[PDB]
Design a protein around this ligand. Structure first.
Ligand SMILES: Nc1c2nc(Br)n3c2nc[n+]1[C@@H]1O[C@H](COP(=O)(O)OP(=O)(O)OC[C@H]2O[C@@H]3[C@H](O)[C@@H]2O)[C@@H](O)[C@H]1O
Ligand SMILES: Nc1ncnc2c1nc(Br)n2[C@@H]1O[C@H](COP(=O)(O)OP(=O)(O)OC[C@H]2OC[C@H](O)[C@@H]2O)[C@@H](O)[C@H]1O
Lengths: 252, 252
């Protein structure tokens, strides 16, 4: 009902950066060139000392240029509407990289903050519902983070979707994938591998080769990428079956 | 040779702060000591001592101060099976592990030791864990285990490797046998054993036989209820996700 910013933004941000730098993803992802306090300054100039709605997609540009890590070939995952499953399956960078394993992704994941014109330059009480803010403002941070990450992808990329939502198609132009990732994929990308997630016990809404997925197949091949698509592949199925052993789809 | 974690203080501080503000919020409670005080407690336990001058009480003030009350029926202990038990407990949402609690999360996989000379810790090198006496070598994780075991309430779970020919499911000298089981209080009402049979390996340890029967008697003598299961479905699926063609991952 009121939307409360994260406490001690700097401290938390600097805390994760430092943790990350020294101890996270060591063999999986490169360290980045800039120190944590340099990263803080690029992050903070993007919103401090302006209205909370006073942002666009240029705003965090310098932050993302500094934070961008080269990303391992064939490992990049995108996801829509399946945060829990896509992450369980990407298994913390072992099998796939998500945006949330990346430095910027990790530092800001789940955090809430916004600017205010008066000192200390950010609000510590309340943030607006970002439905009140123009889209470029609401989406300045994660939108650009998605774009920067997709622009760094190389080789085969993977896309996990929900193909069980009757209200939300598997693929949409209007998702973060559809707005910021698919169209920023460069000619170092060779293939989009789609994994459709049919939630256990639920009506199958979207199918490979049909509907929004066919719309995507087309978008993909039109970008010159190879394309494939699987519906609950054994590896993913088992993972769903772990949280719902009895589900008919998991029968021994 | 073994390399200490760099910037141990900032790494500790950074994790402590990230934890306090953002981690396990609806799952585990905050401690009242602030980060810096906890650092003071942690540092005093091993600083300005021989790297091997450590006993089961060196870190007592750290833990007292860092110990969190642990939610009923969620406590898991583990042996021989870090990845599976951790994947299974699923970041404190199915069960809690020590690694989810403040102290285990701040220190997981870090490497530090004291020296008598200024600045009181060693940044270059720490002794191989085997030159050092058991009580000093187990001085940090051993007391973490006792403290955490001491805090468990209701039904506790113990996940074990049933396929190690060299290492019993239960051993009077594991961390479980030495630090956890004996620190279980009257707050505890049951010990639930989960025996993990690795996919495509000889089944070695069985429920009601061998070390598991030894455990069963020790547990009952302590007036706790006892069950034990081998590869329950939820866990089996978890293993099959990682190796789906396994004979045992067979489906309809
Ligand atoms: N929390 C930890 C822990 N954290 C780390 Br980084 N280690 C740990 N070992 C035990 N425990 C606690 O003690 C119990 C398991 O101890 P066990 O005697 O069965 O030991 P094994 O499982 O065979 O090996 C664990 C290895 O990882 C390291 C150790 O250096 C060690 O080399 C758990 O319930 C847990 O709460
Ligand atoms: N732990 C968590 N931490 C943070 N957020 C969590 C969360 N858990 C959930 Br559950 N969400 C939210 O689920 C909402 C629905 O968005 P969506 O339809 O699933 O996917 P897209 O629009 O395609 O954006 C995704 C693409 O851009 C980023 C990444 O590269 C990915 O590929 C999101 O707004 C999340 O905030």
């Amino acid at each position: 009902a009121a939307i409360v910013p994260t406490r001690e933004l700097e401290n938390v941000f600097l805390g994760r950066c430092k943790d990350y730098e020294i101890t996270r993803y060591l063999d999986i992802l490169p360290r980045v060139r800039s120190d944590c306090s340099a990263l803080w300054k690029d992050f903070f100039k993007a919103f401090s000392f302006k209205n909370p709605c006073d942002l666009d997609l240029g705003s965090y540009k310098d932050f993302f240029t500094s934070a961008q890590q080269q990303l391992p070939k064939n490992k990049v995952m995108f996801w829509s509407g399946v945060y829990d499953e896509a992450h369980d399956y990407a298994n913390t960078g072992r099998k796939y990289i998500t945006l949330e394993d990346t430095l910027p992704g990790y530092m800001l994941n789940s955090l809430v903050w916004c600017g205010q014109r008066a000192n200390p330059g950010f609000n510590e009480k309340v943030c607006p519902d970002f439905k009140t803010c123009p889209v470029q403002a609401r989406e300045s941070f994660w939108g650009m983070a998605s774009s920067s990450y997709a622009h760094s992808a190389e080789g085969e990329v993977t896309y996990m979707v929900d193909g069980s939502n009757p209200k939300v198609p598997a693929y949409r132009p209007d998702s973060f994938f559809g707005k910021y990732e698919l169209p920023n994929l460069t000619n170092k990308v060779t293939r989009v591998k789609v994994i459709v997630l049919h939630r256990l016990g639920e009506k199958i809404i979207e199918k490979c080769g049909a509907g929004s997925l066919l719309d995507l197949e087309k978008l993909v091949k039109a970008k010159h990428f190879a394309f494939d698509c699987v519906e609950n592949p054994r590896a993913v199925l088992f993972l769903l079956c772990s949280d719902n052993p009895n589900a008919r789809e998991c029968r021994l």
